């Protein structure tokens, strides 16, 4: 499989380090958004998503810190519709360096 990044490791790219890139989790998939760390990077548009899975937050589109779940273990249709689509938006934009595992 891919590199597969754990929530722990993935949480090491929320934008703040010097080299450490920026990886976002979506439905358990680690995506690359470093292309715009200005948004995800330390304190940015996706400050809550940085080093966190904003699947639910993406779905309902709340960007809530609690809506950031590394698992769709609840993601309803409302969020799924958007979340699921959010995947294509991020997947068809951000490079997948791996998929969230642990």
Curated annotation (Swiss-Prot):
Domain of life: Eukaryota
UniProt similarity note: Belongs to the cytochrome b5 family. MAPR subfamily.
Gene Ontology terms, MF aspect: steroid binding
Coiled coil location: none
SUPFAM superfamilies: Cytochrome b5-like heme/steroid binding domain
Species the sequence originates in: Arabidopsis thaliana
Primary location: nucleus
Transmembrane segments annotated in the record for this chain: none
Domain-level remarks: The cytochrome b5 heme-binding domain lacks the conserved iron-binding His residues at positions 37 and 61.
Gene3D superfamilies tied to this protein: Cytochrome b5-like heme/steroid binding domain (3.10.120.10)
Induction of expression: Down-regulated by auxin and cytokinin.
Name this polypeptide is given: Probable steroid-binding protein 3
């Amino acid at each position: 499989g891919p590199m597969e990044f754990t929530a722990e490791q993935l949480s090491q790219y929320n934008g703040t380090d010097e080299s450490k890139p920026i990886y976002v989790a979506i439905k358990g998939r680690v995506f690359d958004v470093t292309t715009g760390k200005s948004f995800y990077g330390s304190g940015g548009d996706y400050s809550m998503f940085a080093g966190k899975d904003a699947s639910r937050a993406l779905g309902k589109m709340s960007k809530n810190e609690e809506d950031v779940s590394p698992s769709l273990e609840g993601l309803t249709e409302k969020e799924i519709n958007t979340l699921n689509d959010w995947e294509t938006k991020f997947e068809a934009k951000y490079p997948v360096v791996g998929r969230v595992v642990s």
